[PDB]
Amino acid sequence: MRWRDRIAVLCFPPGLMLTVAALILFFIHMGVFASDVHNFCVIHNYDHMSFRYTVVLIFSQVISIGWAAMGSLYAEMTGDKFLRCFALTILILNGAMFFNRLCLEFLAINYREERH
Amino acid sequence: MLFIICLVFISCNVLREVKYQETWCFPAYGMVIGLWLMLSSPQRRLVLNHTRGMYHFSIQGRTVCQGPMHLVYVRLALSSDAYGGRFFQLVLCGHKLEPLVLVQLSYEQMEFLGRHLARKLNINYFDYLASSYRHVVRHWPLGASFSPGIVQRKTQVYTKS
Amino acid sequence: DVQEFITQMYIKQLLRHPAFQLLLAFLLLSNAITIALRTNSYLGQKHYELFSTIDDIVLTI
Amino acid sequence: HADPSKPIPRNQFHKSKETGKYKQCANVTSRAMCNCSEHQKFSHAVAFSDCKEKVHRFKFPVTQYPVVLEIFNERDKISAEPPYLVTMTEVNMRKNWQLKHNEPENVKKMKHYLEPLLKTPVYNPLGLNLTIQGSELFHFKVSVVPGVSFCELSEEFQIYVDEVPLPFPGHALIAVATSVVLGVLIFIAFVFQLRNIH
Ligand SMILES: *[C@@H]1O[C@H](CO)[C@@H](O[C@@H]2O[C@H](CO)[C@@H](O)[C@H](O)[C@H]2NC(C)=O)[C@H](O)[C@H]1NC(C)=O
Numbered sequence: 001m002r003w004r005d006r007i008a009v010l011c012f013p014p015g016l017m018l019t020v021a022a023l024i025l026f027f028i029h030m031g032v033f034a035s036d037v038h039n040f041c042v043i044h045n046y047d048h049m050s051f052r053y054t055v056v057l058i059f060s061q062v063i064s065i066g067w068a069a070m071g072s073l074y075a076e077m078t079g080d081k082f083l084r085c086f087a088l089t090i091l092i093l094n095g096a097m098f099f100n101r102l103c104l105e106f107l108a109i110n111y112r113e114e115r116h
Numbered sequence: 117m118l119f120i121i122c123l124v125f126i127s128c129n130v131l132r133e134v135k136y137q138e139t140w141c142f143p144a145y146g147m148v149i150g151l152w153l154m155l156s157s158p159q160r161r162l163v164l165n166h167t168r169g170m171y172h173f174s175i176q177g178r179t180v181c182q183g184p185m186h187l188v189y190v191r192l193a194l195s196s197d198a199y200g201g202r203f204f205q206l207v208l209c210g211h212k213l214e215p216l217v218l219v220q221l222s223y224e225q226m227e228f229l230g231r232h233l234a235r236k237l238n239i240n241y242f243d244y245l246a247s248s249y250r251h252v253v254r255h256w257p258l259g260a261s262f263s264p265g266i267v268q269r270k271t272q273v274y275t276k277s
Numbered sequence: 278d279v280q281e282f283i284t285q286m287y288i289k290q291l292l293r294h295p296a297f298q299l300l301l302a303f304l305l306l307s308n309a310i311t312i313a314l315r316t317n318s319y320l321g322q323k324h325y326e327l328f329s330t331i332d333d334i335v336l337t338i
Numbered sequence: 339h340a341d342p343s344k345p346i347p348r349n350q351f352h353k354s355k356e357t358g359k360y361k362q363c364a365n366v367t368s369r370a371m372c373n374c375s376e377h378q379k380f381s382h383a384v385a386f387s388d389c390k391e392k393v394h395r396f397k398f399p400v401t402q403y404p405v406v407l408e409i410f411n412e413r414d415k416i417s418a419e420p421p422y423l424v425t426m427t428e429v430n431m432r433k434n435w436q437l438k439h440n441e442p443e444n445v446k447k448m449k450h451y452l453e454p455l456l457k458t459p460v461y462n463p464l465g466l467n468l469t470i471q472g473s474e475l476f477h478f479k480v481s482v483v484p485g486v487s488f489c490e491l492s493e494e495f496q497i498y499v500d501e502v503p504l505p506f507p508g509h510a511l512i513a514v515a516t517s518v519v520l521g522v523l524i525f526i527a528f529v530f531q532l533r534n535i536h
């Protein structure tokens with residue numbers, strides 16, 4: 001019960017701030033990808049997608065991967081095994097989103113607009 | 117790191133109002149804005165309780181940790197560069213506080229206020245009584261628990277052959 | 278303070294590492310070859326997809 | 339190349355299904371009932387599109403495509419003159435094309451008067467250059483500006499550009515893909531080394 005009481009009073013060791021800041025980003029991203037794969041597939045509507053924000057989505061997903069990496073090592077530098085088995089997934093978790101949000105792009109490539 | 121909060125929040129404001137007038141290029145500089153307030157938050161004030169040789173760490177009126185300062189002396193560890201460079205890092209009593217490293221080390225007035233402060237704080241200024249190159253002996257009061265480093269602190273220290 | 282020096286130790290042992298330098302040299306050299314070949318209207322098109330990809334990969338790195 | 343008694347190429351989406359009309363071969367079920375002459379197939383005119391199956395094909399970027407316009411006058415066929423100013427439109431509404439032209443000081447005043455009244459830019463023949471950045475069929479329409487002839491002069495041509503390289507979000511994306519894919523392997527060593535020292 002000591003562990004929570006300390007950090008309840010005051011701020012946090014560095015690893016917790018970054019890592020959790022990628023969990024919200026993982027959800028904020030999980031929402032949008034769901035709606036985009038919703039509209040592309042179920043209601044088969046090609047209007048209510050991204051393609052107005054196709055860059056900020058990808059940019060953030062780079063941050064959401066990088067921030068997990070920096071936060072992970074701090075936990076592993078501290079060595080707390082609870083964090084160690086925790087963050088490593090969050091690196092691979094957000095690694096799943098990036099490789100999925102990237103295949104939704106090469107799928108909706110003939111459905112976005114044109115640039116060349 | 118409130119200066120960064122001071123830095124990013126200003127940038128957001130100048131980026132708050134703009135007219136890009138460009139296709140796509142969604143104005144989403146707000147991803148910075150969160151980073152501004154994030155580092156903003158709790159002033160840190162450290163008091164040297166030299167009466168009992170103690171050091172208690174707190175900020176905004178909430179104690180975090182404490183430890184005695186029986187062996188007190190000023191130490192600055194070397195932070196070498198990948199180029200042919202020399203940089204200063206100040207670690208006092210073998211502890212991990214806010215870095216009091218020598219700013220703009222590569223400064224006479226900067227080190228002058230330290231000698232008064234080390235005189236004000238009533239601890240030795242080892243890196244000042246002889247200030248040419250890397251020469252400081254960490255005190256590392258026995259109140260701390262840096263055993264893998266506290267003993268190793270003398271290992272990096274030169275014993276003058 | 279104890280930890281980040283190792284992370285700084287890691288940054289040094291990566292950035293100053295010679296395999297990294299050799300890879301970056303290989304990329305920039307390949308890009309220079311692509312520039313030389315683009316100085317030819319015919320080959321400008323046929324592998325336009327490859328030249329553009331390499332062009333962006335080197336910039337991101 | 340409407341053979342209505344067939345499936346249809348792209349009906350995903352609702353709006354696409356709504357925006358369709360067979361102007362010729364409009365109610366028949368067997369492409370057999372509608373009659374398309376050989377000249378109907380050969381000519382690029384609108385309302386002849388349903389009979390159109392073979393088109394001129396073009397390699398990705400079409401640059402400096404010469405629009406040669408000839409006026410036929412029984413006895414002769416002369417080239418289009420600067421007095422016969424012209425307008426280009428794209429009947430299919432596509433808008434990834436450019437037209438380059440030279441303006442000698444014979445139309446600076448014709449061009450400047452006509453553009454607001456017509457609300458569509460007017461070009462000088464004899465120097466027309468067409469540039470295309472697209473991956474499918476383009477149907478253009480060339481019309482002499484009203485007020486200079488008693489006979490509408492007009493012309494139709496079709497260009498099918500194929501081999502287009504990739505829509506934008508597909509090189510910046512590959513660029514970020516490789517970097518992060520690499521950057522993970524870099525990250526692997528940093529963690530992996532920690533377990534080795536420990
Ligand atoms: C449209 O393209 C034609 C090329 O077919 C250009 O005609 C050439 O113009 C140059 C002058 O810049 C001459 O030296 C060439 O002899 C011309 N070639 C032919 C075949 O006529 C024409 O200039 C272009 N139009 C514009 C407005 O630049």
Ligand SMILES: *[C@@H]1O[C@H](CO)[C@@H](O)[C@H](O)[C@H]1NC(C)=O
Nearest residue numbers: 360361362363364365366372
């Ligand atoms: C069928 O199409 C013809 C055009 O050829 C049109 O005149 C007629 O009104 C149409 N009738 C129906 C029932 O669609």
Ligand SMILES: *[C@@H]1O[C@H](CO)[C@@H](O)[C@H](O)[C@H]1NC(C)=O
Nearest residue numbers: 363364366370371372373374
């Ligand atoms: C096409 O020709 C046939 C006879 O060859 C004729 O019966 C038919 O009506 C024609 N098609 C149309 C749409 O009139």
